[PDB]
Amino acid sequence: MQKARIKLASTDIKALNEVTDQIRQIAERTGVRMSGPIPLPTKRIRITTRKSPDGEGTATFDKFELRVHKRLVDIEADERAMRQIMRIRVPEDVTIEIELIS
Amino acid sequence: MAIERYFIEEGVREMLIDEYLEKELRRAGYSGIDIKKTPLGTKVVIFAASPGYVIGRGGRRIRELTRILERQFGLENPQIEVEEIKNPYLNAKVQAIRLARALERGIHFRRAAYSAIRAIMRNGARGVEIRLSGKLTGERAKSVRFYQGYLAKVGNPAETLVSRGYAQAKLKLGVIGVKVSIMPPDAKLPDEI
Amino acid sequence: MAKADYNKRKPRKFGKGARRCVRCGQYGPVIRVHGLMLCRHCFREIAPKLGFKKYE
Amino acid sequence: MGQKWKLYEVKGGKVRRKNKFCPRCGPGVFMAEHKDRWSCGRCGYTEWKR
RNA sequence: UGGAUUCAACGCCGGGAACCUCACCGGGGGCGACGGCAGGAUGAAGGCCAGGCUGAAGGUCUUGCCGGACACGCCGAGAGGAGGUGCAUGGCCGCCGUCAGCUCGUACCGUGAGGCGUCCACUUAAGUGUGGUAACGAGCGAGACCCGCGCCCCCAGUUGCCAGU
RNA sequence: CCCCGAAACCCCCGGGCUACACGCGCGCUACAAUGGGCGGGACAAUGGGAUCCGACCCCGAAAGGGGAAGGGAAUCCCCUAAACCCGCCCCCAGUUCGGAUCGCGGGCUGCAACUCGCCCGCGUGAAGCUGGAAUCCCUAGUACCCGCGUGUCAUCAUCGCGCGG
Ligand SMILES: [Mg+2]
Ligand SMILES: [Mg+2]
Ligand SMILES: [Mg+2]
Ligand SMILES: [Mg+2]
Ligand SMILES: [Mg+2]
Ligand SMILES: [Zn+2]
């Protein structure tokens, strides 16, 4: 049996958790062996602008931040499992990617 | 294409869409949009307060609009549809724009502001604040804040709960800035019942 | 009036003229860190709409 | 606008062209004369009498 | 070229400018939407072959060139303007100041403007609290809140770690 | 709002913003031994990467050049940091301190390197031997000292924002 990596990334831990729970509950609905939602290092896109247009006055900065949480899940590749994980809702603020290790 | 690139791209695109529609549907109480890239195409949903105005004359408006959408902005297959705000009187940018529209009609600012405040606080908001800033009452500019109810300013609960809205009223002699802030019926930390 | 039009929108490939904010159209202080192309001013105005937050 | 350019000369029952022709080009192309060479009106490129 | 001149201008305008950026200088070339006016496509609105000028240019031109087609040669009326005005404005920023202040309802005091609360003593980073008190209560702000670091537990074990076998 | 409006709009070439008898602000390097050089030995983190990072091999004295695995990012690379330590020369002097300046040559970026870029090698060898009055920052993993990353970025960091030692 050959395995399937599912790399999924979001800005919302709760959507992320929703997807992982979908996968957990569907694998245990069936009996295929999950590999946990391995949490990968989350990316902190930091942008440190100066908050002034004038150029006059004291220099003050806005440190804006975007956070990307990332998980990966390995599940054995079955046609059933694959069909239904394709059927998954995959909400709007999330990306996924089903690679297959063979 | 890296993943953060993807997020950034989507946000920027959507922001520019939002800008365009804010310009063109300001009569309609355009509150915002949402966008989903379904397989058959990308379907978007415009939340506004007068879908009558956004459709115009038998879909004329949505038609030229979707043309603009797929052309000027990278979009697979636009599938515009329209929806309402469940409580626009709790939305605050729609109200800011309605107020600016009024001031442009020519209504006096105290009357318009107090009318809108009455409406919001009857439609059930815990608090409301309205700043009008500019050439009110002559040539030297001033600022006036009309407030009612209970409103927070500082902290994460403000950054989250209260809805902020801004608009310009472009009048004969210049701009009036309209800031609106609405606090709905939802609770804070130090309540402790 | 037989002539040749000479506006010549020259295609810069590097430079402060090459890069332009997609909103206002400013040429200098442009953000290009992760695929953006935005003037610092605009970015500060819209960052929440893109999802950028100010927790520090 | 130069604005009057009747060049053909009617021989009688048929016209004869005041034009010259370019060999490396197609038909209909008409030419000028500048003292040692021709000129293409369609596109314009190098040529001489020779 | 400009802006900014104590704090709060002077490695600031994210201003590390070869062109661009630029707004300065010398030179060169394009631009009237809408109408009307001089007209009109008759073959041209527009592009254009070889050259002379030109820094270089179908920019222009004696000399000639046609792919099939309207008008700044003239008015209004404009597009655009990093042109002026930041004592006409908005928005943002700085400073007062992350300072601890700003107020309200009712009551009382005063003809009234106003006052009281919001004062005093301790305390606190804090109008933060305790007590006294014609004040009693409340709200914004402070605090709460949000982010991160540091210790433990649970879950998870890849692309991470490798002690044990 | 006023003005320009066929010029105060748009584009191109070239110059300038990089000029220098001088005054000022903030900083870098130093005025040496609480060191300089040479050779050896060690120990990071933050962040970033598509026409982008580039290991690895070869060429070259260097800067650099050719080919190129892998890497759209806990997989690969940038990335074995410097201050520190060990040994050897120098032994208190305009010096084996200091590196302004300038000459010759060799390169990278770019359409273009004169005006006006950055790097390398040989050479040169400027003031400066601790600084008046006066003034600035700082209360713990802080200040001082050390280097690194990134933003700006075609090439340019004595800068900004940050990282650790
Ligand atoms: Mg007070
Ligand atoms: Mg607070
Ligand atoms: Mg030396
Ligand atoms: Mg000495
Ligand atoms: Mg700088
Ligand atoms: Zn912008």
mmCIF file with all atom_site columns, all heavy atoms in Angstrom, chain E residues 2 31 49 66 75 92 103 111 121:
data_model
loop_
_atom_site.group_PDB
_atom_site.id
_atom_site.type_symbol
_atom_site.label_atom_id
_atom_site.label_alt_id
_atom_site.label_comp_id
_atom_site.label_asym_id
_atom_site.label_entity_id
_atom_site.label_seq_id
_atom_site.pdbx_PDB_ins_code
_atom_site.Cartn_x
_atom_site.Cartn_y
_atom_site.Cartn_z
_atom_site.occupancy
_atom_site.B_iso_or_equiv
_atom_site.pdbx_formal_charge
_atom_site.auth_seq_id
_atom_site.auth_comp_id
_atom_site.auth_asym_id
_atom_site.auth_atom_id
_atom_site.pdbx_PDB_model_num
ATOM 1   P P     . G E 1 2   ? 15.171  74.637 -4.630  1.00 0.00 ? 2   G E P     1
ATOM 2   O OP1   . G E 1 2   ? 15.163  76.115 -4.726  1.00 0.00 ? 2   G E OP1   1
ATOM 3   O OP2   . G E 1 2   ? 16.080  73.983 -3.660  1.00 0.00 ? 2   G E OP2   1
ATOM 4   O "O5'" . G E 1 2   ? 13.685  74.140 -4.354  1.00 0.00 ? 2   G E "O5'" 1
ATOM 5   C "C5'" . G E 1 2   ? 13.172  74.068 -3.035  1.00 0.00 ? 2   G E "C5'" 1
ATOM 6   C "C4'" . G E 1 2   ? 11.910  73.246 -2.959  1.00 0.00 ? 2   G E "C4'" 1
ATOM 7   O "O4'" . G E 1 2   ? 12.130  71.926 -3.528  1.00 0.00 ? 2   G E "O4'" 1
ATOM 8   C "C3'" . G E 1 2   ? 11.400  72.960 -1.555  1.00 0.00 ? 2   G E "C3'" 1
ATOM 9   O "O3'" . G E 1 2   ? 10.665  74.037 -1.007  1.00 0.00 ? 2   G E "O3'" 1
ATOM 10  C "C2'" . G E 1 2   ? 10.595  71.683 -1.745  1.00 0.00 ? 2   G E "C2'" 1
ATOM 11  O "O2'" . G E 1 2   ? 9.324   71.943 -2.312  1.00 0.00 ? 2   G E "O2'" 1
ATOM 12  C "C1'" . G E 1 2   ? 11.441  70.951 -2.773  1.00 0.00 ? 2   G E "C1'" 1
ATOM 13  N N9    . G E 1 2   ? 12.446  70.082 -2.146  1.00 0.00 ? 2   G E N9    1
ATOM 14  C C8    . G E 1 2   ? 13.790  70.210 -2.323  1.00 0.00 ? 2   G E C8    1
ATOM 15  N N7    . G E 1 2   ? 14.489  69.329 -1.669  1.00 0.00 ? 2   G E N7    1
ATOM 16  C C5    . G E 1 2   ? 13.537  68.565 -1.017  1.00 0.00 ? 2   G E C5    1
ATOM 17  C C6    . G E 1 2   ? 13.689  67.457 -0.152  1.00 0.00 ? 2   G E C6    1
ATOM 18  O O6    . G E 1 2   ? 14.725  66.904 0.218   1.00 0.00 ? 2   G E O6    1
ATOM 19  N N1    . G E 1 2   ? 12.462  66.986 0.281   1.00 0.00 ? 2   G E N1    1
ATOM 20  C C2    . G E 1 2   ? 11.252  67.519 -0.065  1.00 0.00 ? 2   G E C2    1
ATOM 21  N N2    . G E 1 2   ? 10.169  66.942 0.445   1.00 0.00 ? 2   G E N2    1
ATOM 22  N N3    . G E 1 2   ? 11.094  68.548 -0.871  1.00 0.00 ? 2   G E N3    1
ATOM 23  C C4    . G E 1 2   ? 12.272  69.016 -1.305  1.00 0.00 ? 2   G E C4    1
ATOM 24  P P     . C E 1 31  ? -0.611  65.226 -31.493 1.00 0.00 ? 31  C E P     1
ATOM 25  O OP1   . C E 1 31  ? -1.455  64.517 -32.486 1.00 0.00 ? 31  C E OP1   1
ATOM 26  O OP2   . C E 1 31  ? -0.033  66.549 -31.838 1.00 0.00 ? 31  C E OP2   1
ATOM 27  O "O5'" . C E 1 31  ? -1.464  65.362 -30.156 1.00 0.00 ? 31  C E "O5'" 1
ATOM 28  C "C5'" . C E 1 31  ? -1.936  64.202 -29.488 1.00 0.00 ? 31  C E "C5'" 1
ATOM 29  C "C4'" . C E 1 31  ? -2.364  64.506 -28.078 1.00 0.00 ? 31  C E "C4'" 1
ATOM 30  O "O4'" . C E 1 31  ? -1.238  65.000 -27.320 1.00 0.00 ? 31  C E "O4'" 1
ATOM 31  C "C3'" . C E 1 31  ? -3.424  65.584 -27.919 1.00 0.00 ? 31  C E "C3'" 1
ATOM 32  O "O3'" . C E 1 31  ? -4.738  65.085 -28.129 1.00 0.00 ? 31  C E "O3'" 1
ATOM 33  C "C2'" . C E 1 31  ? -3.195  66.078 -26.496 1.00 0.00 ? 31  C E "C2'" 1
ATOM 34  O "O2'" . C E 1 31  ? -3.864  65.256 -25.553 1.00 0.00 ? 31  C E "O2'" 1
ATOM 35  C "C1'" . C E 1 31  ? -1.686  65.893 -26.327 1.00 0.00 ? 31  C E "C1'" 1
ATOM 36  N N1    . C E 1 31  ? -0.920  67.155 -26.420 1.00 0.00 ? 31  C E N1    1
ATOM 37  C C2    . C E 1 31  ? -1.036  68.082 -25.390 1.00 0.00 ? 31  C E C2    1
ATOM 38  O O2    . C E 1 31  ? -1.805  67.840 -24.452 1.00 0.00 ? 31  C E O2    1
ATOM 39  N N3    . C E 1 31  ? -0.330  69.226 -25.442 1.00 0.00 ? 31  C E N3    1
ATOM 40  C C4    . C E 1 31  ? 0.487   69.450 -26.463 1.00 0.00 ? 31  C E C4    1
ATOM 41  N N4    . C E 1 31  ? 1.160   70.599 -26.473 1.00 0.00 ? 31  C E N4    1
ATOM 42  C C5    . C E 1 31  ? 0.635   68.515 -27.524 1.00 0.00 ? 31  C E C5    1
ATOM 43  C C6    . C E 1 31  ? -0.075  67.389 -27.457 1.00 0.00 ? 31  C E C6    1
ATOM 44  P P     . C E 1 49  ? 9.677   54.138 -43.585 1.00 0.00 ? 49  C E P     1
ATOM 45  O OP1   . C E 1 49  ? 10.264  53.493 -42.383 1.00 0.00 ? 49  C E OP1   1
ATOM 46  O OP2   . C E 1 49  ? 9.992   55.560 -43.860 1.00 0.00 ? 49  C E OP2   1
ATOM 47  O "O5'" . C E 1 49  ? 10.070  53.255 -44.852 1.00 0.00 ? 49  C E "O5'" 1
ATOM 48  C "C5'" . C E 1 49  ? 11.412  52.885 -45.107 1.00 0.00 ? 49  C E "C5'" 1
ATOM 49  C "C4'" . C E 1 49  ? 11.708  52.918 -46.583 1.00 0.00 ? 49  C E "C4'" 1
ATOM 50  O "O4'" . C E 1 49  ? 10.547  53.411 -47.306 1.00 0.00 ? 49  C E "O4'" 1
ATOM 51  C "C3'" . C E 1 49  ? 12.842  53.836 -47.003 1.00 0.00 ? 49  C E "C3'" 1
ATOM 52  O "O3'" . C E 1 49  ? 14.105  53.208 -46.883 1.00 0.00 ? 49  C E "O3'" 1
ATOM 53  C "C2'" . C E 1 49  ? 12.471  54.201 -48.432 1.00 0.00 ? 49  C E "C2'" 1
ATOM 54  O "O2'" . C E 1 49  ? 12.820  53.159 -49.333 1.00 0.00 ? 49  C E "O2'" 1
ATOM 55  C "C1'" . C E 1 49  ? 10.952  54.290 -48.331 1.00 0.00 ? 49  C E "C1'" 1
ATOM 56  N N1    . C E 1 49  ? 10.482  55.651 -47.972 1.00 0.00 ? 49  C E N1    1
ATOM 57  C C2    . C E 1 49  ? 10.680  56.770 -48.789 1.00 0.00 ? 49  C E C2    1
ATOM 58  O O2    . C E 1 49  ? 11.200  56.735 -49.890 1.00 0.00 ? 49  C E O2    1
ATOM 59  N N3    . C E 1 49  ? 10.205  57.977 -48.428 1.00 0.00 ? 49  C E N3    1
ATOM 60  C C4    . C E 1 49  ? 9.572   58.143 -47.287 1.00 0.00 ? 49  C E C4    1
ATOM 61  N N4    . C E 1 49  ? 9.145   59.378 -46.997 1.00 0.00 ? 49  C E N4    1
ATOM 62  C C5    . C E 1 49  ? 9.365   57.038 -46.424 1.00 0.00 ? 49  C E C5    1
ATOM 63  C C6    . C E 1 49  ? 9.819   55.839 -46.791 1.00 0.00 ? 49  C E C6    1
ATOM 64  P P     . C E 1 66  ? 1.498   56.159 -54.417 1.00 0.00 ? 66  C E P     1
ATOM 65  O OP1   . C E 1 66  ? 1.940   55.517 -55.679 1.00 0.00 ? 66  C E OP1   1
ATOM 66  O OP2   . C E 1 66  ? 1.209   57.612 -54.384 1.00 0.00 ? 66  C E OP2   1
ATOM 67  O "O5'" . C E 1 66  ? 0.197   55.401 -53.913 1.00 0.00 ? 66  C E "O5'" 1
ATOM 68  C "C5'" . C E 1 66  ? 0.038   54.006 -54.125 1.00 0.00 ? 66  C E "C5'" 1
ATOM 69  C "C4'" . C E 1 66  ? -0.303  53.295 -52.847 1.00 0.00 ? 66  C E "C4'" 1
ATOM 70  O "O4'" . C E 1 66  ? 0.604   53.772 -51.817 1.00 0.00 ? 66  C E "O4'" 1
ATOM 71  C "C3'" . C E 1 66  ? -1.725  53.553 -52.348 1.00 0.00 ? 66  C E "C3'" 1
ATOM 72  O "O3'" . C E 1 66  ? -2.399  52.346 -51.959 1.00 0.00 ? 66  C E "O3'" 1
ATOM 73  C "C2'" . C E 1 66  ? -1.541  54.526 -51.180 1.00 0.00 ? 66  C E "C2'" 1
ATOM 74  O "O2'" . C E 1 66  ? -2.478  54.390 -50.135 1.00 0.00 ? 66  C E "O2'" 1
ATOM 75  C "C1'" . C E 1 66  ? -0.122  54.227 -50.697 1.00 0.00 ? 66  C E "C1'" 1
ATOM 76  N N1    . C E 1 66  ? 0.541   55.415 -50.140 1.00 0.00 ? 66  C E N1    1
ATOM 77  C C2    . C E 1 66  ? 0.744   55.502 -48.762 1.00 0.00 ? 66  C E C2    1
ATOM 78  O O2    . C E 1 66  ? 0.413   54.575 -48.012 1.00 0.00 ? 66  C E O2    1
ATOM 79  N N3    . C E 1 66  ? 1.328   56.608 -48.261 1.00 0.00 ? 66  C E N3    1
ATOM 80  C C4    . C E 1 66  ? 1.696   57.607 -49.053 1.00 0.00 ? 66  C E C4    1
ATOM 81  N N4    . C E 1 66  ? 2.258   58.665 -48.472 1.00 0.00 ? 66  C E N4    1
ATOM 82  C C5    . C E 1 66  ? 1.479   57.560 -50.452 1.00 0.00 ? 66  C E C5    1
ATOM 83  C C6    . C E 1 66  ? 0.909   56.457 -50.944 1.00 0.00 ? 66  C E C6    1
ATOM 84  P P     . C E 1 75  ? -7.969  80.090 -31.144 1.00 0.00 ? 75  C E P     1
ATOM 85  O OP1   . C E 1 75  ? -7.005  81.022 -30.507 1.00 0.00 ? 75  C E OP1   1
ATOM 86  O OP2   . C E 1 75  ? -7.878  78.631 -30.876 1.00 0.00 ? 75  C E OP2   1
ATOM 87  O "O5'" . C E 1 75  ? -9.445  80.558 -30.775 1.00 0.00 ? 75  C E "O5'" 1
ATOM 88  C "C5'" . C E 1 75  ? -10.000 80.226 -29.515 1.00 0.00 ? 75  C E "C5'" 1
ATOM 89  C "C4'" . C E 1 75  ? -11.504 80.375 -29.491 1.00 0.00 ? 75  C E "C4'" 1
ATOM 90  O "O4'" . C E 1 75  ? -12.074 79.851 -30.721 1.00 0.00 ? 75  C E "O4'" 1
ATOM 91  C "C3'" . C E 1 75  ? -12.213 79.598 -28.391 1.00 0.00 ? 75  C E "C3'" 1
ATOM 92  O "O3'" . C E 1 75  ? -12.207 80.268 -27.141 1.00 0.00 ? 75  C E "O3'" 1
ATOM 93  C "C2'" . C E 1 75  ? -13.600 79.393 -28.976 1.00 0.00 ? 75  C E "C2'" 1
ATOM 94  O "O2'" . C E 1 75  ? -14.379 80.578 -28.884 1.00 0.00 ? 75  C E "O2'" 1
ATOM 95  C "C1'" . C E 1 75  ? -13.253 79.128 -30.435 1.00 0.00 ? 75  C E "C1'" 1
ATOM 96  N N1    . C E 1 75  ? -12.969 77.695 -30.677 1.00 0.00 ? 75  C E N1    1
ATOM 97  C C2    . C E 1 75  ? -13.980 76.736 -30.587 1.00 0.00 ? 75  C E C2    1
ATOM 98  O O2    . C E 1 75  ? -15.131 77.082 -30.297 1.00 0.00 ? 75  C E O2    1
ATOM 99  N N3    . C E 1 75  ? -13.665 75.442 -30.820 1.00 0.00 ? 75  C E N3    1
ATOM 100 C C4    . C E 1 75  ? -12.420 75.089 -31.124 1.00 0.00 ? 75  C E C4    1
ATOM 101 N N4    . C E 1 75  ? -12.152 73.807 -31.350 1.00 0.00 ? 75  C E N4    1
ATOM 102 C C5    . C E 1 75  ? -11.381 76.040 -31.223 1.00 0.00 ? 75  C E C5    1
ATOM 103 C C6    . C E 1 75  ? -11.698 77.311 -30.988 1.00 0.00 ? 75  C E C6    1
ATOM 104 P P     . C E 1 92  ? -7.900  58.520 10.426  1.00 0.00 ? 92  C E P     1
ATOM 105 O OP1   . C E 1 92  ? -8.268  57.214 10.995  1.00 0.00 ? 92  C E OP1   1
ATOM 106 O OP2   . C E 1 92  ? -8.297  59.780 11.083  1.00 0.00 ? 92  C E OP2   1
ATOM 107 O "O5'" . C E 1 92  ? -6.327  58.495 10.253  1.00 0.00 ? 92  C E "O5'" 1
ATOM 108 C "C5'" . C E 1 92  ? -5.733  57.387 9.617   1.00 0.00 ? 92  C E "C5'" 1
ATOM 109 C "C4'" . C E 1 92  ? -4.295  57.615 9.248   1.00 0.00 ? 92  C E "C4'" 1
ATOM 110 O "O4'" . C E 1 92  ? -4.184  58.690 8.280   1.00 0.00 ? 92  C E "O4'" 1
ATOM 111 C "C3'" . C E 1 92  ? -3.357  58.034 10.353  1.00 0.00 ? 92  C E "C3'" 1
ATOM 112 O "O3'" . C E 1 92  ? -2.974  56.984 11.212  1.00 0.00 ? 92  C E "O3'" 1
ATOM 113 C "C2'" . C E 1 92  ? -2.212  58.640 9.568   1.00 0.00 ? 92  C E "C2'" 1
ATOM 114 O "O2'" . C E 1 92  ? -1.422  57.634 8.966   1.00 0.00 ? 92  C E "O2'" 1
ATOM 115 C "C1'" . C E 1 92  ? -2.972  59.380 8.481   1.00 0.00 ? 92  C E "C1'" 1
ATOM 116 N N1    . C E 1 92  ? -3.274  60.753 8.911   1.00 0.00 ? 92  C E N1    1
ATOM 117 C C2    . C E 1 92  ? -2.293  61.731 8.937   1.00 0.00 ? 92  C E C2    1
ATOM 118 O O2    . C E 1 92  ? -1.284  61.596 8.294   1.00 0.00 ? 92  C E O2    1
ATOM 119 N N3    . C E 1 92  ? -2.659  62.969 9.229   1.00 0.00 ? 92  C E N3    1
ATOM 120 C C4    . C E 1 92  ? -3.823  63.178 9.804   1.00 0.00 ? 92  C E C4    1
ATOM 121 N N4    . C E 1 92  ? -4.134  64.396 10.178  1.00 0.00 ? 92  C E N4    1
ATOM 122 C C5    . C E 1 92  ? -4.807  62.199 9.890   1.00 0.00 ? 92  C E C5    1
ATOM 123 C C6    . C E 1 92  ? -4.482  61.001 9.448   1.00 0.00 ? 92  C E C6    1
ATOM 124 P P     . U E 1 103 ? -14.172 67.902 30.747  1.00 0.00 ? 103 U E P     1
ATOM 125 O OP1   . U E 1 103 ? -14.347 69.169 30.009  1.00 0.00 ? 103 U E OP1   1
ATOM 126 O OP2   . U E 1 103 ? -14.027 67.936 32.214  1.00 0.00 ? 103 U E OP2   1
ATOM 127 O "O5'" . U E 1 103 ? -15.393 66.962 30.377  1.00 0.00 ? 103 U E "O5'" 1
ATOM 128 C "C5'" . U E 1 103 ? -16.413 66.696 31.315  1.00 0.00 ? 103 U E "C5'" 1
ATOM 129 C "C4'" . U E 1 103 ? -17.231 65.506 30.912  1.00 0.00 ? 103 U E "C4'" 1
ATOM 130 O "O4'" . U E 1 103 ? -16.539 64.286 31.262  1.00 0.00 ? 103 U E "O4'" 1
ATOM 131 C "C3'" . U E 1 103 ? -18.574 65.348 31.578  1.00 0.00 ? 103 U E "C3'" 1
ATOM 132 O "O3'" . U E 1 103 ? -19.565 66.225 31.074  1.00 0.00 ? 103 U E "O3'" 1
ATOM 133 C "C2'" . U E 1 103 ? -18.863 63.879 31.341  1.00 0.00 ? 103 U E "C2'" 1
ATOM 134 O "O2'" . U E 1 103 ? -19.279 63.659 30.008  1.00 0.00 ? 103 U E "O2'" 1
ATOM 135 C "C1'" . U E 1 103 ? -17.478 63.271 31.516  1.00 0.00 ? 103 U E "C1'" 1
ATOM 136 N N1    . U E 1 103 ? -17.231 62.702 32.858  1.00 0.00 ? 103 U E N1    1
ATOM 137 C C2    . U E 1 103 ? -17.950 61.618 33.267  1.00 0.00 ? 103 U E C2    1
ATOM 138 O O2    . U E 1 103 ? -18.810 61.113 32.588  1.00 0.00 ? 103 U E O2    1
ATOM 139 N N3    . U E 1 103 ? -17.626 61.160 34.508  1.00 0.00 ? 103 U E N3    1
ATOM 140 C C4    . U E 1 103 ? -16.682 61.654 35.353  1.00 0.00 ? 103 U E C4    1
ATOM 141 O O4    . U E 1 103 ? -16.486 61.172 36.444  1.00 0.00 ? 103 U E O4    1
ATOM 142 C C5    . U E 1 103 ? -15.988 62.757 34.856  1.00 0.00 ? 103 U E C5    1
ATOM 143 C C6    . U E 1 103 ? -16.275 63.222 33.665  1.00 0.00 ? 103 U E C6    1
ATOM 144 P P     . U E 1 111 ? -28.687 82.324 45.762  1.00 0.00 ? 111 U E P     1
ATOM 145 O OP1   . U E 1 111 ? -28.699 83.737 46.189  1.00 0.00 ? 111 U E OP1   1
ATOM 146 O OP2   . U E 1 111 ? -29.515 81.347 46.482  1.00 0.00 ? 111 U E OP2   1
ATOM 147 O "O5'" . U E 1 111 ? -29.152 82.237 44.250  1.00 0.00 ? 111 U E "O5'" 1
ATOM 148 C "C5'" . U E 1 111 ? -30.528 82.188 43.931  1.00 0.00 ? 111 U E "C5'" 1
ATOM 149 C "C4'" . U E 1 111 ? -30.836 82.850 42.616  1.00 0.00 ? 111 U E "C4'" 1
ATOM 150 O "O4'" . U E 1 111 ? -30.509 84.250 42.699  1.00 0.00 ? 111 U E "O4'" 1
ATOM 151 C "C3'" . U E 1 111 ? -30.066 82.361 41.409  1.00 0.00 ? 111 U E "C3'" 1
ATOM 152 O "O3'" . U E 1 111 ? -30.614 81.195 40.832  1.00 0.00 ? 111 U E "O3'" 1
ATOM 153 C "C2'" . U E 1 111 ? -30.103 83.553 40.478  1.00 0.00 ? 111 U E "C2'" 1
ATOM 154 O "O2'" . U E 1 111 ? -31.314 83.592 39.743  1.00 0.00 ? 111 U E "O2'" 1
ATOM 155 C "C1'" . U E 1 111 ? -30.056 84.713 41.455  1.00 0.00 ? 111 U E "C1'" 1
ATOM 156 N N1    . U E 1 111 ? -28.716 85.288 41.625  1.00 0.00 ? 111 U E N1    1
ATOM 157 C C2    . U E 1 111 ? -28.303 86.212 40.725  1.00 0.00 ? 111 U E C2    1
ATOM 158 O O2    . U E 1 111 ? -28.974 86.530 39.777  1.00 0.00 ? 111 U E O2    1
ATOM 159 N N3    . U E 1 111 ? -27.073 86.729 40.973  1.00 0.00 ? 111 U E N3    1
ATOM 160 C C4    . U E 1 111 ? -26.244 86.446 41.997  1.00 0.00 ? 111 U E C4    1
ATOM 161 O O4    . U E 1 111 ? -25.170 87.011 42.076  1.00 0.00 ? 111 U E O4    1
ATOM 162 C C5    . U E 1 111 ? -26.759 85.495 42.890  1.00 0.00 ? 111 U E C5    1
ATOM 163 C C6    . U E 1 111 ? -27.938 84.966 42.682  1.00 0.00 ? 111 U E C6    1
ATOM 164 P P     . A E 1 121 ? -3.849  65.869 51.308  1.00 0.00 ? 121 A E P     1
ATOM 165 O OP1   . A E 1 121 ? -2.704  66.737 51.643  1.00 0.00 ? 121 A E OP1   1
ATOM 166 O OP2   . A E 1 121 ? -4.029  65.371 49.927  1.00 0.00 ? 121 A E OP2   1
ATOM 167 O "O5'" . A E 1 121 ? -3.789  64.610 52.262  1.00 0.00 ? 121 A E "O5'" 1
ATOM 168 C "C5'" . A E 1 121 ? -3.873  64.777 53.663  1.00 0.00 ? 121 A E "C5'" 1
ATOM 169 C "C4'" . A E 1 121 ? -3.899  63.459 54.370  1.00 0.00 ? 121 A E "C4'" 1
ATOM 170 O "O4'" . A E 1 121 ? -5.216  62.877 54.275  1.00 0.00 ? 121 A E "O4'" 1
ATOM 171 C "C3'" . A E 1 121 ? -2.977  62.413 53.794  1.00 0.00 ? 121 A E "C3'" 1
ATOM 172 O "O3'" . A E 1 121 ? -1.654  62.576 54.260  1.00 0.00 ? 121 A E "O3'" 1
ATOM 173 C "C2'" . A E 1 121 ? -3.643  61.110 54.200  1.00 0.00 ? 121 A E "C2'" 1
ATOM 174 O "O2'" . A E 1 121 ? -3.323  60.770 55.534  1.00 0.00 ? 121 A E "O2'" 1
ATOM 175 C "C1'" . A E 1 121 ? -5.119  61.484 54.132  1.00 0.00 ? 121 A E "C1'" 1
ATOM 176 N N9    . A E 1 121 ? -5.773  61.127 52.865  1.00 0.00 ? 121 A E N9    1
ATOM 177 C C8    . A E 1 121 ? -5.984  61.950 51.802  1.00 0.00 ? 121 A E C8    1
ATOM 178 N N7    . A E 1 121 ? -6.626  61.410 50.815  1.00 0.00 ? 121 A E N7    1
ATOM 179 C C5    . A E 1 121 ? -6.860  60.138 51.279  1.00 0.00 ? 121 A E C5    1
ATOM 180 C C6    . A E 1 121 ? -7.506  59.062 50.707  1.00 0.00 ? 121 A E C6    1
ATOM 181 N N6    . A E 1 121 ? -8.028  59.102 49.509  1.00 0.00 ? 121 A E N6    1
ATOM 182 N N1    . A E 1 121 ? -7.594  57.926 51.395  1.00 0.00 ? 121 A E N1    1
ATOM 183 C C2    . A E 1 121 ? -7.056  57.892 52.602  1.00 0.00 ? 121 A E C2    1
ATOM 184 N N3    . A E 1 121 ? -6.422  58.840 53.266  1.00 0.00 ? 121 A E N3    1
ATOM 185 C C4    . A E 1 121 ? -6.362  59.953 52.536  1.00 0.00 ? 121 A E C4    1
#
